[PDB]
Ligand binder design. Structure first.
Ligand code: NA
Length: 129
């Protein structure tokens, strides 16, 4: 599924991501934009041989099991394919654990480099929320 911007904002809000660990909804929407372009089926190979899965590009090194990331953990206890679902429940549940891990949203390098400190509320402008 390719979400629309306000569609994704509404789904993230419904699953309680807005102001989760103090990150306003615009931060989550901005991260999804640059990680996945709002595409639930986005997969990208990392140099270390790990893969990033889904709207929030969650890494098989630590968070999900893909059967092919040696020495990896599955701290969200889910198959990585569950993060490609048109239903974002699993991706949100996992992102909550990631963002609780001590470095907040800096764990998303595209958030640090492209969203952090910017006008993130622009991302939920004109949305019926
Ligand atoms: Na893994």
């Amino acid at each position: 599924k390719v979400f629309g911007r306000c569609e994704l904002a509404a789904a993230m809000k419904r699953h309680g991501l807005d102001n989760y660990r103090g990150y306003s909804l615009g931060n989550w929407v901005c991260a999804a934009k640059f990680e996945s372009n709002f595409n639930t089926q986005a997969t990208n190979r990392n140099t270390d041989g790990s893969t990033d899965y889904g709207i929030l590009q969650i890494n098989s090194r630590w968070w999900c099991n893909d059967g092919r990331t040696p020495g990896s953990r599955n701290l969200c206890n889910i198959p990585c394919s569950a993060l490609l679902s048109s239903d974002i429940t699993a991706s949100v549940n996992c992102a909550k654990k990631i963002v609780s891990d001590g470095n907040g949203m800096n764990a998303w390098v595209a958030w640090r480099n492209r969203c952090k400190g910017t006008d993130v509320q622009a991302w939920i402008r004109g949305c019926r929320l």
